[PDB]
Design a protein around this ligand. Structure first.
Ligand SMILES: [Cl-]
Ligand SMILES: [Mg+2]
Length: 540
DNA sequence: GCCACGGCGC
DNA sequence: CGCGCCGTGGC
């Protein structure tokens, strides 16, 4: 019947809002409305109307809370049916999609969004009845985490603009060097960024052997996997690979970052999304912190650009081998649990079991083999891939994988048990009961079935790691406020804080303690911590 | 501007 | 070895 009533709404109303753009830190609030009992109240002047609300309840509540924080309003996010939908099925990642699946329509009008939010919340809440683990995640993780994320996004991080100018110049000079040499080898200029023009140069003009097709166009692929095979076939190949590496880094993590510095705050406001991934891991965007290269000289150079405010320090905390520890816990493998209890270098210790030698006798290459499998086993890394990674024969790679499962037989069992669970129930679950649906486990084509199988036993591990971190963020947040410290970034199994230099050390001790004790496992949780004026220094 | 796409990073 | 990111090329 569409009851309209004057602004302001009664307490408990769901909010609907329209932004000029999707990024709340950069957007104008174009419209605000609230709904309760289906009765809609539309705000005459949105910004003024914000201070009437006591919390943001509704779709994308966190995003409205971010914009409110920018304006200096304390408007914490509360109930949001996105969070409910994501717990019901993590393929539910957007309002549009949630509405299309469960009822109603995501439109561009505030009042309609508010009414929809209220409807969907009631709907999805009923759908969750009796799902006590998922409801626990909602109350103890998702809802309170949304408030942490709002604060992190609104706070942002300071960038070293002088450093970024210098890094940009350095990389530009090396890129120019490389493309000069490519054009020399090629005999003319062409657009290096064009895979079409590159294909013609490599395979038509230079006559190099093609290998793989492109996914859809059917052309001769110029991908890294193809070039890798040809590194010796022609010196231009190596140069192109270096060019692509640097250009990706510059175009993604050097050129965009200064443009992302907000004119009002002077800081970068990375956006955090808690309903975006299949596993329950948080995601970041503008920039995506997850895709900054790891363990290359280049990745390091990017993190150096992230700095503390003057008189402050960054505190970086990292859960050491958390996914393997989780695998130990879920599988119950006594030998792997022993690896973590006899706690020296974990990969050396894994190698000593694998190869049946004392830890003293493990050489660095043996350790690398163990390290590589400790991560590959989590997603069913093939012998073929391991063979490329370690540069060993295929048969030897096979033997290494078998050694691993021979020493850790309950890991082998756990993988198979998890697949049985997925095939029986149609879903798999984390330690805390976060759930992922895995329909293709019973597929016709083996190609898709194997991808489904990897997804199936990988998610419980990644998802458990994800929720340990999120639970730690929730526990840690209010205690940081006590100290005048703040939470800035989260990526992988790492958390970055900012604190006054006088309190950095105490903040580090406190954060370490809370993270390591967030939940008891069969093995200890270990947190590496460092302090520095920049993120790279603080990783040290 | 829109899009699908190859390519690359985790 | 799903998803966010880049620039390209068609519209
Ligand atoms: Cl937008
Ligand atoms: Mg051009």
């Amino acid at each position: 019947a569409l009851e309209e009533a004057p602004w302001p709404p009664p307490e408990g109303a769901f909010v609907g809002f329209v932004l000029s753009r999707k990024e709340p830190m950069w957007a104008d609030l174009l419209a605000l409305a609230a709904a309760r009992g289906g009765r809609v109240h539309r705000a005459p002047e949105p910004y003024k109307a914000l201070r009437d609300l006591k919390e943001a309840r509704g779709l994308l509540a966190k995003d409205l809370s971010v914009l409110a924080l920018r304006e200096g309003l304390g408007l914490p996010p509360g109930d949001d049916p996105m969070l409910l939908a994501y717990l019901l099925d993590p393929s539910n990642t957007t309002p549009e999609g949630v509405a299309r699946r469960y009822g109603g329509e995501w439109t561009e009008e505030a009042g309609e969004r508010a009414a929809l939010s209220e409807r969907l919340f009631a709907n999805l809440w009923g759908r969750l009845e009796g799902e006590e683990r998922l409801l626990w995640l909602y109350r103890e993780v998702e809802r309170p985490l949304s408030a942490v994320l709002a604060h992190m996004e609104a706070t942002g991080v300071r960038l070293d603009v002088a450093y970024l100018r210098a890094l940009s110049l350095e990389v530009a000079e090396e890129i120019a060097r490389l493309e000069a040499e490519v054009f020399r080898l090629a005999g003319h200029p062409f657009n290096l960024n064009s895979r079409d023009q590159l294909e013609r140069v490599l395979f038509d003009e230079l006559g190099l052997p093609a290998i793989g097709k492109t996914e859809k166009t059917g052309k001769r692929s110029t991908s890294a996997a193809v070039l890798e095979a040809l590194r010796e076939a022609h010196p231009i190949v190596e140069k192109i690979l270096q060019y692509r590496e640097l250009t990706k880094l510059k175009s993604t993590y050097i050129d965009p970052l200064p443009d992302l510095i907000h004119p009002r705050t002077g800081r970068l406001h990375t956006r955090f999304n808690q309903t975006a991934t299949a596993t329950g891991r948080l995601s970041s965007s503008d920039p995506n912190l997850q895709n900054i290269p790891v363990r290359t000289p280049l990745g390091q150079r990017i993190r150096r650009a992230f700095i503390a405010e003057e008189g402050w320090l960054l505190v970086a905390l990292d859960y050491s081998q958390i996914e393997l520890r989780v695998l130990a816990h879920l599988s119950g493998d006594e030998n792997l649990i022993r690896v973590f209890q006899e706690g020296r270098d974990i990969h050396t210790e894994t190698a000593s079991w694998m190869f049946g030698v004392p830890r003293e006798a493990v050489d660095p290459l043996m350790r690398r083999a163990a390290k590589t499998i400790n991560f590959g086993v989590l997603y069913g890394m093939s012998a073929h891939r391991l063979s490329q990674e370690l540069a060993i024969p295929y048969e030897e790679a096979q033997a290494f994988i078998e050694r691993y499962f021979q020493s850790f037989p309950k890991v082998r069992a756990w993988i198979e048990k998890t697949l049985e669970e997925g095939r029986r129930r149609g879903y798999v679950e984390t330690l805390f009961g976060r759930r992922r649906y895995v329909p293709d486990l019973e597929a016709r084509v083996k190609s898709v079935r194997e991808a489904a199988e990897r997804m199936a036993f990988n998610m419980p591990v990644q998802g458990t790691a994800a929720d340990l971190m999120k639970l730690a963020m929730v526990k840690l947040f209010p205690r940081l406020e006590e100290m005048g410290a703040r939470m800035l970034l989260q990526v992988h199994d790492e958390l970055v804080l900012e604190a006054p230099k006088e309190r950095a050390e105490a903040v580090a001790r406190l954060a370490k303690e809370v993270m390591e004790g967030v939940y008891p496992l069969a093995v200890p949780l270990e947190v590496e911590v460092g302090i520095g004026e920049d993120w790279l220094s603080a990783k040290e």
